[PDB]
Structure 1
Amino acid sequence: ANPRYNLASTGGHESDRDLISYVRGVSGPGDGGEGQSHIARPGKTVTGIAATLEREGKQVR
């Protein structure tokens, strides 16, 4: 419901990343030519995520 993003490296303190930064594809860490965080998808955009689970041929997505 309220996932803790990047918990492996940011554990102990508040997480840097959020859902908005994943949808927009911000590149906070990797810089070198960073155009203000280099938002990959600044305009109207759609992001989809899907996970499939199986058990004895029964599927749940």
Structure 2
Amino acid sequence: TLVDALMTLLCANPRYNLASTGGHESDRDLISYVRGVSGPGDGGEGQSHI
């Protein structure tokens, strides 16, 4: 996440969390970092994941 934060500055469209899929695809957006979304919450209305 630290590296993602830095990467937002140097790049036109940085691919967050790239090293998770060996170079295949990115999973996370930008906003969730601002929102501090701690993972995907439970479906029972959640709200404990943000």
Relative to the length of structure 2, the TM-score reads 0.50
Number of residue pairs aligned between Structure 1 and Structure 2: 35
Considering fraction of residues, name the structure with more strand.
1
Instruction: Sort the Cα spacing of 1:24 and 1:4 in 2 relative to 1 into closer, same or farther, 3 A.
Output: same
Q: Do the aligned residues in 2 keep the contact of 1:6 with 1:17 (CA within 8 Å)?
A: yes
SS of 1:16's equivalent? coil
Structure 2 counterpart of 1:50? none
Higher Cα Rg, which structure: 1
> Which residue in the other structure is 1:12 paired with?
24
Ranges of 4+ aligned residues in structure 1 off by more than 3 Å: none
What amino acid maps onto 2:20 in structure 1?
S
Of residues 19, 23, 41, the one that matches 2:34 is 23
Q: Please list the CA deviations of residues 1-53 of structure 1 after superposition, one character each: whole Å capped at 9, or x if unmatched.
A: 1110001103312x121110111111126x68xx34611xxxxxxxxxxxxxx
Unaligned runs of 5+ in 2: 1-11
Identity of aligned residues (%): 89
Greater helix share, 1 or 2? Answer: 2
Structure 1, gaps ≥5 residues long: 40-61
Aligned residues: CA RMSD:
2.5
